[PDB]
């Protein structure tokens, strides 16, 4: 069996077992979005 996929560049609907939390804004936090991890401040955006 050969599994093929792509990572951290487009929408995804298959994920590992993890618990999601609530969204914190205007505060420096560690974040993990669909596997992309980092640190920063999250604000609402006007981009479409």
């Amino acid at each position: 069996v050969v599994l093929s996929f792509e990572l951290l560049n487009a929408p995804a609907t298959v994920c590992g077992p993890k618990l999601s939390t609530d969204l914190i804004k205007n505060q420096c936090v560690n974040f993990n979005f669909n596997g992309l991890t980092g640190t920063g401040v999250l604000t609402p955006s006007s981009k479409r």
């Binding site: 401040v41 604000t43 955006s45």
Partner: protein
């Protein structure tokens, strides 16, 4: 024209005012606040 005029608010002379008007600078304050940069993101400021 080459000496400052007490009447005008400016402390420079007329020709000095012309000279300062002829050169354009990206910014002059040397002060850019975190709130200013975070809140004008849509502008994509080079200084930010």
């Amino acid at each position: 024209q080459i000496l400052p005029d007490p009447l005008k608010p400016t402390k420079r002379s007329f020709i000095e005012d012309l000279l300062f008007n002829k050169v354009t600078l990206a910014d002059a304050g040397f002060m850019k606040q975190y709130g200013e940069c975070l809140g004008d993101i849509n502008a994509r400021d080079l200084i930010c």
